[PDB]
Design a protein around this ligand. Structure first.
Ligand SMILES: O=P(O)(O)C(O)(Cn1ccnc1)P(=O)(O)O
Ligand SMILES: O=P(O)(O)C(O)(Cn1ccnc1)P(=O)(O)O
Ligand SMILES: [Mg+2]
Ligand SMILES: [Mg+2]
Ligand SMILES: [Mg+2]
Ligand SMILES: [Mg+2]
Ligand SMILES: [Mg+2]
Ligand SMILES: [Mg+2]
Lengths: 335, 329
């Protein structure tokens, strides 16, 4: 789709941004490249990262209830709010995971120190919170309250998911591993990534009134969800050769859980051991059973399943939005 | 005061968090996070929420209030765990900082826990007071932590000693933002809201003028305690922080001491402190803290409502007692 226009709204978002930082009263503005620090921050973090999720809200927003003026902009804004929200999440993430890189540029916690990273996170959170309260002018009180409730659930869930991700207690005799993993992925990834933006979408959209069987869309966003997380995990096993990444950590991953549904007593002693220590050797075992083989299997049932539940949408017009959605996601994973 | 039983509602406050946690080990993780971080300490800021909220005794939004109080206790704890990382805190409230018992990745993550939680429990007050109140509660919170963060940025963003014509102005400006206003404006302003009191808005900026100096006076002491007792490189000076003492010493030092500070600032805090004592800076807090109180009292004495200068008399009493009955001899 076009989508160039959302992306052009940025500059009114920094207007709308900069036009908050009138925070102190009675001076000639000297103490006040604080306002310059955080515009910088925004260009760096919010101004990179594909803007996948903000797209999804603006996408979903433009079909369920086509717009034509003057709320159109309240949507772009939130879509950049989404992006600002996502960004703060992965600033946090890159810290916890000692990451190096993101959105092309190195990690913010790297450049501006970790102590500043932590402050800027909740800066971005607090601007998002207060920016969401702008809508009330354009969209009315209850439609912003439903937007709140959605912000809260998704960011909270992400926080419990991110907690499982951190949890030091992955064990040897683990046969629920597949269920630890996937249902964490639902929390730490699918909520903010797909649930939040899509469900944002049709608050602003406010149409149509689809209910009851509307657990269907939350069943697609779930799978899109782990579709993503499960692609991001593979690309890590496939595509980084550093002297410490993922399985260096005790990182509950897709190639590790289904190497635990195929491997033997002998293999599962392989993983257990040099996990956290020897990623190459663990990566080797991964090769042996060719992780990206079955990975290529996941993908087609994972698209098959999305496909068939696509053609079960009550909204012929929202049927195709998700088919659009499912399409770019795949492509985006296929790059 | 009591107060008993805002503290005793902590139980009922826990139950409401556990029920937020029907998602569905993590539960027992985060229930202990809150006991570890929220249950522990003086609870001064949630104490303030009720006090102000005290003198419409008509509904059982008296639980509701309490939970808010404990929501306010959560916000300070999740502020402060942030702080202890950024500052290399060792101990807070007599106990190992959270990022220490639970490392940085979790302390960072759990900050997000304490704060979404804050957000959710607030969101569910719509029933008890209804839409307009919550909406307004929602907007103190946003300013309060928003300014706190800017305030925390400034604490991180180091000053220019060389150009210290008025670092004091930075100091007090930073101070009002990183402290005053999640400590004082937010608690006080939540409680002014739940109450819905009659309402002397014109007479607002006065009590607003009070919170400014409740706040100032709060930090100013903290900064001096650190100066007075903290013995390490993990300290104010070694960490190169902008603080009442060094701010004053620049107001109070000849061109000798002041050049001799900005060199050991902040490597050999021993030497930085040596000066203060021969600036006798602890002399200068006391005449501060001395003038702090009456100016709060003058200030307090001008509150019109007369049922709202009451609790603002207890408020002023509480903090000064708090700030004065520390390590004395
Ligand atoms: O694998 P992670 O969960 O750390 C990641 O996917 C980020 N993330 C964090 C929460 N959900 C996803 P990324 O590989 O982008 O660093
Ligand atoms: O000295 P800080 O301002 O960092 C402090 O007073 C905490 N704080 C943080 C913001 N306002 C106050 P603490 O000495 O308790 O670590
Ligand atoms: Mg990561
Ligand atoms: Mg991660
Ligand atoms: Mg990853
Ligand atoms: Mg500190
Ligand atoms: Mg500090
Ligand atoms: Mg201090």
């Amino acid at each position: 789709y076009d989508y160039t226009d959302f992306i052009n709204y940025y500059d009114k978002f920094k207007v709308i941004v900069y036009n908050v930082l009138k925070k102190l009263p009675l001076n000639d503005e000297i103490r006040k490249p604080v306002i310059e620090y955080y515009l910088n921050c925004i260009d760096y973090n919010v101004k990179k990262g594909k803007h996948i999720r903000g797209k999804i809200l603006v996408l979903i927003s433009s079909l369920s209830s086509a717009y034509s003026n003057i709320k159109r902009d309240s949507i772009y804004l939130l879509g950049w709010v989404v992006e600002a929200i996502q960004a703060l999440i992965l600033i946090a993430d890159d810290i916890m995971d000692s990451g190096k890189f993101r959105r092309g540029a190195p990690c913010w916690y790297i450049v501006h120190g970790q102590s500043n990273a932590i402050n800027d996170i909740f800066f971005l959170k607090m601007l998002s919170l207060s920016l969401i309260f702008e809508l009330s002018s354009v969209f009315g009180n209850d439609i912003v309250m439903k937007i709140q409730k959605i912000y809260n659930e998704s960011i909270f869930f992400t926080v419990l998911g991110q907690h499982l991700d951190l949890s030091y207690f992955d064990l040897s005799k683990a046969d629920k591993i597949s269920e630890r993993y996937f249902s964490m992925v639902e929390m730490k990834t699918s909520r903010y990534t797909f649930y939040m933006p899509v469900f944002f979408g049709l608050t602003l959209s406010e149409i149509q009134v689809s209910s009851a069987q509307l657990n269907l869309i939350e069943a697609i966003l779930y799978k899109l969800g782990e579709f993503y997380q499960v692609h991001n995990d593979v690309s890590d096993y496939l595509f980084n050769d550093s002297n410490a990444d993922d399985i260096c950590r005790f990182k509950l991953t897709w190639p590790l859980q289904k190497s635990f549904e195929i491997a033997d007593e002998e293999m599962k002693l392989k993983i257990s051991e040099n996990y956290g220590k020897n990623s190459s050797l663990v990566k080797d075992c991964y090769n042996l059973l060719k992780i990206n083989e079955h990975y290529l299997e996941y993908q087609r049932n994972a698209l098959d399943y999305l496909i068939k539940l696509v053609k079960d949408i009550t909204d012929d017009s929202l049927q195709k939005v998700f088919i659009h959605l499912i399409h770019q996601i795949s492509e985006l994973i296929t790059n």
